[PDB]
Amino acid sequence: NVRRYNERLLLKTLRRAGSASKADLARLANMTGTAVGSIIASLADAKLIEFAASLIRLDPRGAFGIGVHLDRMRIETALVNFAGDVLGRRSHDTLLPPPAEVIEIVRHDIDAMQALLPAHERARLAGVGVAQPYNLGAWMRELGLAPDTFRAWEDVDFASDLGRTVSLPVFGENDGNAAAIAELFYGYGRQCDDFVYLFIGPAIGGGIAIDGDCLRGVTGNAGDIAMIPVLPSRLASAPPPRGPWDILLARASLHALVRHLRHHGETVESRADLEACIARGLPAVTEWIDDCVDALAPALRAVLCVVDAPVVVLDADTDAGLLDALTSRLRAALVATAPEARGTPTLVRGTFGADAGAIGAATLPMYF
Amino acid sequence: NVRRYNERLLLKTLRRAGSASKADLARLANMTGTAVGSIIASLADAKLIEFAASLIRLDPRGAFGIGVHLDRMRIETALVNFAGDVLGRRSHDTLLPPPAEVIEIVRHDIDAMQALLPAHERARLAGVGVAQPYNLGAWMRELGLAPDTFRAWEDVDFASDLGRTVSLPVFGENDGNAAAIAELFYGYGRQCDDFVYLFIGPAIGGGIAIDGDCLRGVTGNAGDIAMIPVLPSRLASAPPPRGPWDILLARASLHALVRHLRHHGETVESRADLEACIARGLPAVTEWIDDCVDALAPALRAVLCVVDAPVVVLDADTDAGLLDALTSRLRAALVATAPEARGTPTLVRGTFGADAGAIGAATLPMYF
């Protein structure tokens, strides 16, 4: 199985270099010219590489994956190629229905994606990845921490239930990890093997890149950014506290922003309502940003104490300026508390935005 | 280099099993009977295994390591064998002198340890490991967070300076990682590959076991338990707060306990003073325990959010009952906040106590 690893590494090195030569792929990865020649030849019979001394790059159309991303107000399905290009997408902005209905919706949308490939190319489609948030469970849902939408989804394995209605093989991943995986393979991870990935969605989520691989955990629950203890919000729109500690989810998620926007009389029912408010420069957004960062900087410091990565990547489900504003304020809060930390990382903007989880979900089938 | 890995794994599997057979070492680790036969034969020529179908165990005297553990009030040097037995130790209960004096102290003590091995066995001595706390740096020292003892040690690489006066090869490790490494190789890690390791010393420290390996980090700074943000102490003996956040170090370290004991009129100058106070059942110890746990339970929850390990190991530099008392209270605090977490780990008492860092420091030379 050591030939399987030397092929993934040669590929990973080509991603970092774009186009490299036989001799270059010896220099990097510190391999013998005889053995990368035999590895290049392995990737060539798999139609995974192509010509750019002769230089080779990955073949963008050498494999395909379909990625499904479920969330409280979004069912999304995307056809992604080997270079991470999104070649097709069906996005439903709807309150997440019961799992039975979603299987039917996703199955049809999986059919429209595979049918975007010509007959002579559908064979390169590796399968389907499903990305979805952690379920907090019944007790925390009925206490107010998670919407009633997820009630029909507790102790329901959607990826398995989907795999028994489609012939393609189905892989499941948490959506924070899936978005980190997109950044690892096609985004900042092409030049950086260690980082903390923060994603501000309806719920906040995240993932942990160590040594070029996404940390998943013993039970698939590593990187659970949403659950880190923080102090209760002091925003007027926050509910009363349930005790001395809250969780990062309550404060640094777009849902908290929507809750705060409604507190100042705004109506927010679609994502387009949310974007319109952000684009109006309302002070209520800045108040939420300050409160968000006030929770997220200490929570992130805790994470950096555990992991010791030099880079933090921040992305979000909604922009219209929101993300740059979050990045500036969070960077300022790190710089102002840097003397009290042993190291302080670089903060970079994520690459894929709302499309991250679907792209990362699509990657799973292509690399296994 | 795939034969180097298959040997470390066969060894790691023997640690877990004690004595196993050729056929057993095939069952476990899922290897071929032909290939573990060739691996057993590799360990036999290295005199690393011995007889307990014929059953084999590791050879306790097949290798040796010397481990050095530096701390603010302790210079310690131990001869450790391949099974983790401590065969010799020189422990100096003294205020940590400048690095120049310590090199001279440790060099003589390294000489007394190697001289405990008979001539025909000194060849199995792999070298020296040095374990020492993270240095907080000048700015945090002069703000009160670290004792003036460490001033002569900032930006001083002790392991390298020691290696240039001894012929043995010298490896350096942080002392929290080193103690985790002892637990990983000889303690709870013989049956458990994933865990968070907490060590209550003069300063608190720790380490992170993932997939059977100690997480070290990009810059050697992973597992920095001491730096996790916590709220300022409300103990009468704590200083005023420096801002809204403190660090776990200020509250969950034995130094905070000593500070609190002095606050109730006790004199504490040696470790024996500290143990006498704990054995008297003074309420001041229970107050500190409550405050310690009040900081450590949220900090640990944060860590578990990142790592997702099912077990937490807790050990301490001083016992006399202190450790069982800390474990009971911390376990109670986890159980009482379990409904607010997505998983809750088992809490176990560490195996090695004050001897952990030296044993883990000694392990480094034997496994490289």
XYZ file of C-alpha atoms in Angstrom:
736
model
C 0.000 0.000 0.000
C 3.120 2.167 -0.119
C 2.487 2.702 -3.832
C -0.924 4.144 -2.984
C 0.718 6.736 -0.722
C 3.487 7.692 -3.157
C 0.760 8.423 -5.710
C -1.322 10.628 -3.423
C 1.835 12.568 -2.520
C 2.976 13.053 -6.116
C -0.544 14.338 -6.808
C -0.509 16.583 -3.746
C 2.871 17.920 -4.848
C 1.541 18.643 -8.337
C -1.351 20.605 -6.821
C 1.208 22.730 -4.991
C 3.334 23.228 -8.115
C 0.693 23.267 -10.842
C 3.038 22.003 -13.545
C 6.249 20.198 -12.613
C 8.798 18.023 -14.397
C 9.946 14.481 -13.761
C 13.105 15.932 -12.197
C 11.102 18.503 -10.227
C 8.874 15.787 -8.777
C 12.139 14.168 -7.639
C 13.448 17.352 -5.954
C 10.171 18.000 -4.153
C 8.905 15.032 -2.108
C 12.561 13.861 -2.073
C 12.005 10.829 -4.307
C 14.098 8.921 -6.830
C 13.818 9.757 -10.511
C 13.210 6.065 -11.187
C 10.316 5.877 -8.716
C 8.404 9.021 -9.716
C 8.779 7.904 -13.321
C 6.968 4.742 -12.258
C 4.448 6.875 -10.320
C 3.864 9.344 -13.174
C 3.256 6.265 -15.323
C 0.738 5.060 -12.728
C -1.119 8.386 -12.823
C -0.992 8.327 -16.635
C -2.761 4.958 -16.884
C -5.388 6.291 -14.473
C -5.788 9.326 -16.794
C -5.172 11.534 -13.764
C -2.352 13.683 -15.205
C -1.616 15.383 -18.515
C 0.995 17.525 -20.226
C 1.220 21.225 -19.408
C 11.909 18.447 -20.167
C 8.185 17.613 -20.320
C 5.992 19.077 -17.559
C 2.819 17.447 -16.256
C -0.206 18.762 -14.395
C -3.234 17.020 -12.978
C -6.004 16.253 -15.452
C -8.932 18.481 -14.363
C -11.342 16.077 -16.088
C -9.623 12.898 -14.849
C -12.226 12.435 -12.117
C -15.526 13.900 -10.933
C -17.479 14.047 -7.703
C -20.964 15.094 -6.704
C -21.245 16.929 -3.404
C -24.404 17.372 -1.335
C -24.578 20.033 1.362
C -27.537 20.053 3.739
C -28.303 22.943 6.103
C -31.344 24.432 7.817
C -32.245 26.640 4.837
C -30.332 25.009 1.971
C -30.271 21.753 0.016
C -27.413 21.981 -2.488
C -25.921 19.519 -4.991
C -22.858 20.213 -7.131
C -20.803 18.446 -9.795
C -17.117 19.114 -9.118
C -14.106 18.090 -11.177
C -10.614 16.968 -10.147
C -9.302 20.560 -10.030
C -12.168 21.679 -7.803
C -14.039 23.456 -10.606
C -17.799 23.454 -10.040
C -19.323 22.270 -13.322
C -22.975 22.153 -12.191
C -25.182 23.007 -9.194
C -28.794 22.701 -8.008
C -29.435 24.868 -4.909
C -32.788 24.858 -3.072
C -33.291 27.794 -0.667
C -35.894 26.084 1.460
C -36.576 25.132 5.029
C -34.923 21.723 5.320
C -37.763 19.208 4.918
C -37.904 15.741 6.557
C -35.200 13.282 5.436
C -37.608 11.266 3.261
C -38.402 14.258 1.039
C -34.747 15.320 0.843
C -33.651 11.908 -0.455
C -36.122 12.355 -3.319
C -34.922 15.908 -3.970
C -31.231 14.989 -3.859
C -31.688 11.828 -5.940
C -33.230 13.806 -8.806
C -30.492 16.459 -8.521
C -27.799 13.785 -8.519
C -29.415 12.642 -11.785
C -29.145 16.099 -13.340
C -25.451 16.359 -12.378
C -24.280 12.996 -13.703
C -26.209 13.774 -16.922
C -24.017 16.846 -17.406
C -21.140 14.492 -18.243
C -20.887 13.034 -21.754
C -21.307 9.270 -22.009
C -17.552 8.833 -22.551
C -16.892 10.711 -19.263
C -19.545 9.564 -16.762
C -17.226 6.668 -15.867
C -14.870 9.144 -14.221
C -17.566 10.060 -11.647
C -16.406 8.616 -8.324
C -19.605 9.027 -6.317
C -21.426 11.333 -3.912
C -20.341 13.100 -0.732
C -22.883 14.378 1.808
C -21.973 17.260 4.111
C -24.219 18.246 7.008
C -23.980 19.968 10.414
C -23.554 18.160 13.697
C -26.851 17.363 15.370
C -26.907 18.768 18.893
C -29.416 16.132 20.034
C -32.920 16.270 21.462
C -32.054 17.716 24.888
C -30.159 20.724 23.534
C -32.729 21.258 20.763
C -35.636 21.449 23.218
C -33.603 23.887 25.357
C -33.370 26.382 22.467
C -29.883 25.737 21.096
C -30.939 24.148 17.770
C -33.984 24.791 15.556
C -36.979 22.462 15.430
C -36.028 21.756 11.774
C -33.491 19.162 12.947
C -36.042 17.226 15.036
C -36.891 14.939 12.101
C -33.138 14.346 11.550
C -31.897 13.099 14.956
C -30.358 9.604 14.855
C -30.944 9.500 11.085
C -27.967 8.556 8.914
C -28.736 10.425 5.720
C -25.652 9.312 3.787
C -26.470 5.646 4.365
C -30.167 6.121 3.559
C -29.152 7.901 0.350
C -26.639 5.207 -0.645
C -29.436 2.639 -0.653
C -31.350 4.543 -3.361
C -28.408 5.463 -5.626
C -25.941 3.148 -7.338
C -23.052 5.559 -6.840
C -21.196 5.126 -3.530
C -22.066 7.722 -0.873
C -19.667 9.216 1.684
C -20.715 11.326 4.672
C -18.751 14.109 6.324
C -19.477 16.909 8.755
C -19.907 20.158 6.852
C -17.224 22.037 8.761
C -14.704 19.325 7.912
C -15.971 19.210 4.305
C -15.390 22.945 3.887
C -11.934 22.601 5.444
C -11.263 19.774 2.997
C -12.124 22.032 0.063
C -9.715 24.653 1.391
C -7.067 21.973 2.010
C -7.235 20.505 -1.521
C -8.007 23.538 -3.724
C -7.575 26.605 -1.551
C -4.975 27.807 0.934
C -3.927 24.169 1.632
C -2.077 24.069 -1.705
C 0.637 26.127 0.026
C -0.062 25.458 3.719
C -0.433 22.071 5.455
C -1.452 23.236 8.947
C -4.330 25.560 9.736
C -7.498 26.188 11.713
C -10.552 26.638 9.458
C -13.427 28.822 10.687
C -16.729 28.958 8.828
C -19.493 31.377 9.818
C -22.691 29.748 8.576
C -26.283 29.679 9.934
C -24.337 27.843 12.597
C -20.624 28.371 13.012
C -18.448 25.399 12.091
C -14.874 24.458 11.428
C -12.114 21.977 10.802
C -8.507 21.302 11.736
C -5.746 20.695 9.192
C -2.687 18.920 10.601
C 0.163 17.732 8.402
C -1.969 18.187 5.314
C -4.864 16.033 6.554
C -8.206 17.005 8.062
C -8.436 15.956 11.712
C -11.623 13.958 12.046
C -11.422 12.502 15.568
C -12.164 9.143 17.153
C -15.899 9.550 16.562
C -15.851 12.042 13.678
C -16.341 14.976 16.071
C -13.005 16.801 16.026
C -13.057 20.452 15.064
C -16.435 21.044 16.798
C -15.871 24.820 16.910
C -19.545 25.450 17.736
C -19.354 23.829 21.173
C -16.445 25.758 22.754
C -17.507 27.433 26.053
C -17.867 31.218 25.850
C -19.423 33.803 28.109
C -23.141 34.610 27.600
C -23.782 37.408 25.113
C -24.366 40.938 26.369
C -26.282 41.901 23.230
C -29.740 43.264 23.939
C -31.138 40.661 21.510
C -29.627 37.707 23.233
C -31.886 35.599 25.461
C -31.126 35.454 29.183
C -28.225 33.147 30.042
C -28.830 29.497 30.945
C -25.859 29.494 33.284
C -22.352 30.901 33.619
C -21.221 29.447 30.286
C -22.690 29.552 26.790
C -21.324 27.980 23.574
C -19.649 29.695 20.630
C -22.598 28.670 18.475
C -24.920 31.070 20.336
C -22.802 34.120 19.532
C -20.616 33.704 16.427
C -23.196 32.242 14.019
C -25.178 34.078 11.358
C -28.313 33.020 13.246
C -27.248 35.300 16.106
C -26.836 38.036 13.492
C -30.343 37.388 12.199
C -31.628 37.385 15.790
C -29.923 40.722 16.397
C -31.195 42.224 13.132
C -34.789 41.304 14.021
C -34.194 43.020 17.361
C -33.796 46.362 15.558
C -37.064 45.981 13.642
C -35.709 44.412 10.432
C -37.509 41.580 8.670
C -35.212 38.699 7.701
C -36.811 35.677 6.049
C -34.551 34.854 3.096
C -30.796 35.015 2.693
C -31.463 37.970 0.374
C -33.040 39.857 3.280
C -29.868 39.133 5.255
C -27.591 40.386 2.475
C -29.648 43.543 1.944
C -29.280 44.439 5.629
C -25.497 43.901 5.550
C -25.206 46.045 2.403
C -27.101 48.896 4.114
C -24.238 49.257 6.618
C -26.638 49.034 9.545
C -24.988 49.620 12.943
C -26.761 46.448 14.125
C -24.368 44.427 11.958
C -21.328 46.120 13.530
C -22.711 45.473 17.009
C -23.057 41.786 16.171
C -19.557 41.713 14.663
C -18.080 43.160 17.864
C -19.967 40.621 19.961
C -19.007 37.817 17.564
C -15.309 38.640 17.747
C -15.541 39.089 21.519
C -16.518 35.438 21.683
C -14.389 34.101 18.841
C -10.950 35.502 19.698
C -10.728 33.698 23.086
C -12.290 30.550 21.596
C -9.751 30.606 18.770
C -6.860 31.194 21.233
C -7.989 28.031 23.045
C -7.915 26.144 19.733
C -4.433 27.434 18.892
C -3.218 26.312 22.315
C -4.273 22.773 21.436
C -3.183 22.629 17.779
C -0.258 25.084 17.264
C -0.975 26.000 13.656
C 0.493 29.187 12.135
C -2.495 30.115 9.929
C -6.209 30.624 10.524
C -8.629 30.640 7.593
C -11.980 32.429 7.963
C -14.892 32.067 5.532
C -18.630 32.656 5.728
C -21.998 31.661 4.273
C -22.818 35.293 3.464
C -20.629 38.188 2.458
C -21.651 41.453 0.814
C -18.790 42.900 2.884
C -19.536 40.949 6.062
C -16.482 38.697 5.775
C -13.874 41.424 5.278
C -15.426 43.248 8.240
C -15.210 40.133 10.426
C -11.620 39.518 9.347
C -10.467 43.057 10.147
C -12.017 43.038 13.619
C -10.825 39.536 14.494
C -7.309 40.332 13.288
C -7.296 43.494 15.424
C -8.415 41.477 18.461
C -5.620 38.961 17.934
C -2.979 41.673 17.518
C -4.171 43.484 20.673
C -3.931 40.291 22.783
C -0.769 38.929 21.109
C 1.541 39.886 24.059
C -0.548 37.511 26.220
C -0.092 34.564 23.811
C 2.972 32.489 23.020
C 2.391 32.623 19.271
C -0.063 34.496 17.040
C -1.146 33.193 13.611
C -1.763 34.810 10.251
C -5.453 35.238 9.405
C -6.510 34.695 5.797
C -9.829 34.890 3.991
C -11.188 31.539 2.794
C -11.448 30.746 -0.893
C -14.842 29.171 -1.518
C -17.563 30.932 0.497
C -21.054 29.463 0.360
C -19.786 26.800 -2.070
C -17.196 25.325 0.326
C -19.143 22.491 1.932
C -20.472 21.192 -1.388
C -17.017 21.305 -2.983
C -15.513 19.469 -0.012
C -18.364 16.961 0.013
C -17.634 16.296 -3.673
C -13.936 15.687 -2.902
C -14.551 12.661 -0.623
C -15.597 10.311 -3.466
C -12.673 11.328 -5.689
C -9.976 10.468 -3.137
C -10.746 6.968 -1.864
C 11.286 2.722 5.365
C 8.152 0.576 5.502
C 10.150 -2.045 7.404
C 10.917 0.555 10.065
C 7.187 1.155 10.576
C 6.199 -2.523 10.647
C 8.748 -2.982 13.437
C 7.501 -0.097 15.570
C 3.948 -1.434 15.192
C 4.836 -5.020 16.093
C 6.566 -3.568 19.163
C 3.605 -1.339 19.986
C 1.322 -4.354 19.631
C 3.514 -6.395 21.976
C 3.306 -3.618 24.575
C -0.476 -3.873 24.370
C -0.440 -7.676 24.623
C 2.561 -8.266 26.871
C 3.301 -11.719 25.479
C 1.947 -12.751 22.082
C 2.630 -15.517 19.575
C 3.724 -15.403 15.960
C 0.120 -16.173 14.988
C -1.229 -13.619 17.470
C 0.997 -10.902 16.020
C -0.608 -11.819 12.681
C -4.190 -11.529 14.013
C -3.524 -8.184 15.680
C -2.041 -5.549 13.345
C -3.579 -7.616 10.499
C -0.260 -8.808 9.064
C 0.925 -11.911 7.234
C 2.511 -14.743 9.182
C 5.445 -14.608 6.768
C 6.031 -10.891 7.362
C 5.829 -10.803 11.169
C 8.147 -13.804 11.197
C 10.590 -11.609 9.295
C 9.834 -8.733 11.707
C 10.195 -10.860 14.857
C 13.530 -11.950 13.386
C 14.431 -8.274 12.937
C 13.615 -7.514 16.581
C 15.558 -10.620 17.644
C 18.784 -9.476 15.961
C 18.326 -6.093 17.646
C 17.958 -7.955 20.985
C 14.682 -6.097 21.487
C 12.430 -9.113 22.174
C 12.687 -12.332 24.166
C 10.707 -15.438 25.039
C 7.925 -15.230 27.615
C 3.489 -22.010 20.073
C 6.332 -19.830 21.395
C 5.349 -16.440 22.850
C 7.577 -13.364 22.802
C 7.658 -10.179 24.850
C 9.806 -7.091 24.602
C 13.237 -7.335 26.198
C 13.114 -4.899 29.160
C 16.919 -4.627 29.033
C 17.135 -4.406 25.225
C 17.572 -0.631 25.369
C 18.083 2.167 27.888
C 17.500 5.897 28.025
C 18.471 8.694 30.365
C 15.823 11.335 30.953
C 16.400 14.839 32.311
C 13.506 16.868 33.689
C 14.055 20.532 34.511
C 11.558 22.632 36.480
C 11.621 25.695 38.720
C 12.396 23.678 41.867
C 13.704 20.387 40.457
C 16.636 19.066 38.437
C 16.066 15.340 37.903
C 17.939 12.659 35.939
C 16.775 9.062 35.557
C 17.972 5.856 33.903
C 14.979 4.130 32.307
C 14.835 0.771 30.559
C 12.849 -0.409 27.530
C 9.837 -1.402 29.670
C 9.749 1.996 31.366
C 11.280 0.737 34.619
C 13.272 3.442 36.401
C 16.617 1.843 37.265
C 18.318 4.941 38.724
C 17.587 8.579 39.627
C 19.348 11.714 40.898
C 16.825 14.384 42.001
C 17.912 17.857 43.172
C 15.206 19.829 45.028
C 16.706 23.225 44.366
C 15.833 26.554 42.862
C 16.720 26.079 39.197
C 20.163 27.672 38.799
C 21.475 29.350 35.607
C 21.889 27.043 32.587
C 25.694 26.924 32.908
C 25.539 25.380 36.389
C 22.783 22.945 35.392
C 24.838 21.540 32.506
C 27.563 20.704 35.032
C 25.043 19.169 37.436
C 23.293 17.122 34.749
C 26.549 16.003 33.113
C 27.793 14.481 36.374
C 24.390 12.845 36.973
C 24.354 11.456 33.442
C 27.723 9.920 34.381
C 26.296 8.231 37.472
C 23.393 6.761 35.459
C 25.388 5.285 32.582
C 27.770 3.815 35.198
C 24.848 1.858 36.652
C 24.947 -0.336 33.539
C 27.494 -3.160 33.330
C 30.139 -2.797 30.631
C 28.402 -5.443 28.495
C 25.162 -3.379 28.632
C 26.160 0.298 28.328
C 26.021 -0.137 24.539
C 22.248 -0.446 24.776
C 21.997 3.142 26.114
C 20.427 5.213 23.335
C 21.080 8.694 24.708
C 19.552 11.507 26.750
C 16.177 13.241 26.610
C 15.634 16.680 28.167
C 12.154 17.726 29.276
C 11.420 21.296 30.336
C 8.469 23.720 30.531
C 7.585 26.229 27.857
C 9.195 29.604 28.422
C 6.552 32.325 28.483
C 9.064 34.957 27.339
C 10.367 38.183 28.832
C 7.190 40.270 28.475
C 4.940 37.805 30.300
C 7.625 37.095 32.919
C 7.999 40.776 33.826
C 4.188 41.057 34.049
C 4.055 38.408 36.806
C 3.037 35.280 34.900
C 6.362 33.399 35.211
C 8.981 33.408 37.992
C 12.263 35.297 37.736
C 14.012 31.876 37.808
C 13.414 31.506 34.059
C 15.037 34.859 33.202
C 18.453 33.223 32.730
C 16.814 30.584 30.473
C 15.034 32.656 27.784
C 16.247 31.944 24.232
C 18.628 29.303 25.617
C 18.515 25.870 23.986
C 19.525 23.632 26.860
C 19.324 20.338 24.964
C 21.718 21.594 22.294
C 24.100 23.129 24.846
C 24.087 19.818 26.725
C 24.692 17.745 23.579
C 27.936 19.629 22.994
C 29.368 18.462 26.342
C 28.207 14.818 26.241
C 28.987 12.170 23.642
C 25.526 10.633 23.904
C 22.935 12.191 21.571
C 20.524 14.611 23.271
C 16.838 15.083 22.421
C 14.655 17.914 23.724
C 10.932 17.819 24.407
C 8.430 19.956 26.264
C 7.733 18.427 29.661
C 3.982 18.181 29.171
C 4.519 16.222 25.962
C 7.236 14.119 27.643
C 4.861 13.127 30.443
C 2.156 12.323 27.889
C 4.717 10.209 26.045
C 5.415 8.201 29.196
C 1.687 7.594 29.618
C 1.363 6.724 25.915
C 4.183 4.136 25.924
C 3.981 2.592 29.419
C 0.748 3.807 30.966
C -2.847 4.126 29.802
C -1.666 4.357 26.145
C -0.992 0.600 26.132
C -4.777 0.180 25.822
C -5.874 3.594 24.514
C -4.522 5.481 21.476
C -6.420 8.774 21.855
C -6.475 10.934 24.960
C -5.955 14.354 26.500
C -3.195 14.352 29.144
C -3.396 16.872 32.001
C -0.502 17.360 34.401
C -0.788 19.603 37.460
C 2.779 20.667 38.212
C 4.297 23.908 39.608
C 2.828 25.014 36.311
C 0.039 23.074 34.670
C 0.978 21.285 31.456
C -0.286 18.693 29.051
C -0.150 16.747 25.832
C -2.424 15.385 23.128
C -2.413 11.755 21.993
C -3.943 11.191 18.552
C -3.818 7.832 16.802
C -1.187 6.614 19.227
C 1.218 9.516 18.637
C 1.881 12.639 20.686
C 0.750 15.770 18.844
C 3.711 18.113 18.809
C 2.628 20.918 16.459
C 4.268 22.905 13.682
C 6.601 24.640 16.133
C 6.580 22.107 18.982
C 3.873 24.060 20.834
C 0.774 21.872 20.563
C -0.882 20.833 23.793
C -0.086 24.188 25.488
C -2.751 23.624 28.166
C -1.326 26.432 30.326
C -2.260 29.188 27.875
C -6.007 28.542 27.408
C -8.083 31.664 28.276
C -10.028 31.403 31.539
C -11.809 33.918 33.710
C -9.767 35.674 36.445
C -9.760 33.845 39.774
C -12.175 34.901 42.500
C -9.954 33.470 45.232
C -9.039 35.993 47.899
C -5.363 35.115 47.305
C -5.408 35.828 43.635
C -3.931 39.132 42.445
C -6.244 41.650 40.785
C -7.072 40.788 37.173
C -4.986 42.174 34.304
C -8.008 42.256 32.033
C -11.158 40.302 31.224
C -9.238 37.093 30.506
C -6.587 35.181 32.433
C -4.801 31.934 31.464
C -5.314 28.443 32.866
C -1.785 28.581 34.250
C -2.782 31.254 36.796
C -5.479 29.090 38.369
C -4.942 25.343 37.857
C -1.243 25.095 38.780
C 0.246 24.011 42.095
C 1.803 27.482 42.302
C -1.700 28.930 42.679
C -2.230 26.373 45.450
C 0.963 27.501 47.159
C -0.123 31.130 46.718
C -3.477 30.312 48.298
C -1.903 28.351 51.165
C 0.370 31.289 52.029
C -2.760 33.448 52.054
C -4.066 31.495 55.064
C -0.855 31.961 57.053
C 0.934 28.725 56.090
C 4.644 28.638 55.317
C 5.479 26.730 52.126
C 9.123 26.626 51.064
C 9.781 22.989 50.143
C 7.611 20.404 48.440
C 7.452 18.711 51.856
C 5.766 21.812 53.282
C 3.244 21.543 50.444
C 2.557 17.860 51.114
C 2.191 18.408 54.862
C -0.488 21.045 54.246
C -2.425 18.759 51.873
C -2.248 15.901 54.399
C -3.697 18.161 57.127
C -6.957 18.407 55.150
C -6.888 22.195 55.320
C -10.012 23.861 53.878
C -7.648 26.130 51.912
C -6.762 23.139 49.726
C -10.444 22.426 49.005
C -11.027 26.079 48.137
C -8.169 25.927 45.640
C -9.468 22.635 44.225
C -12.901 24.176 43.620
C -11.323 27.189 41.934
C -8.977 24.940 39.942
C -11.814 22.799 38.616
C -13.906 25.904 37.930
C -11.209 26.924 35.482
C -10.222 23.498 34.186
C -13.598 22.001 33.246
C -14.416 24.716 30.649
C -10.802 24.729 29.416
C -10.908 20.953 29.011
C -14.301 21.131 27.214
C -12.662 23.514 24.724
C -9.850 20.991 24.206
C -12.303 18.127 23.679
C -14.151 20.216 21.098
C -10.930 20.445 19.101
C -9.602 16.892 19.548
C -12.585 14.524 20.138
C -10.818 12.005 22.354
C -12.830 9.648 24.596
C -10.421 9.606 27.571
C -8.779 12.264 29.727
C -5.790 11.381 31.904
C -5.019 13.534 34.958
C -1.767 13.376 36.937
C 0.050 15.723 39.291
C 3.452 16.667 40.702
C 2.193 16.212 44.270
C -0.349 13.856 45.745
C -0.829 12.888 49.383
C -4.513 12.700 48.407
C -4.545 15.839 46.261
C -4.901 13.968 42.967
C -7.862 11.781 43.933
C -9.556 14.917 45.279
C -8.957 16.788 42.012
C -10.209 13.828 39.986
C -13.448 13.479 41.956
C -14.302 17.173 41.677
C -13.382 17.446 37.998
C -15.369 14.312 37.173
C -18.385 15.742 39.024
C -18.077 18.998 37.064
C -17.993 17.113 33.768
C -21.008 14.971 34.681
C -23.011 18.046 35.769
C -22.341 19.849 32.451
C -22.575 16.735 30.237
C -26.089 17.618 28.886
C -24.521 20.789 27.416
C -21.777 18.844 25.576
C -21.983 16.551 22.574
C -19.759 13.904 24.140
C -18.228 13.443 27.597
C -15.003 11.471 28.183
C -13.848 9.031 30.827
C -11.421 10.535 33.351
C -8.575 8.342 34.583
C -5.734 8.878 37.023
C -2.276 9.019 35.433
C 0.278 6.307 36.075
C 3.610 7.975 36.782
C 3.159 11.064 38.979
C 6.233 13.171 39.668
C 8.324 10.698 37.638
C 6.387 11.175 34.376
C 8.432 13.858 32.639
C 11.747 12.121 33.322
C 10.411 8.771 32.105
C 9.050 10.387 28.943
C 12.274 12.326 28.424
C 14.148 9.010 28.652
C 11.864 7.457 26.004
C 12.865 9.893 23.212
C 16.390 8.453 22.763
C 15.160 4.846 22.736
C 12.707 5.331 19.860
C 14.611 7.099 17.082
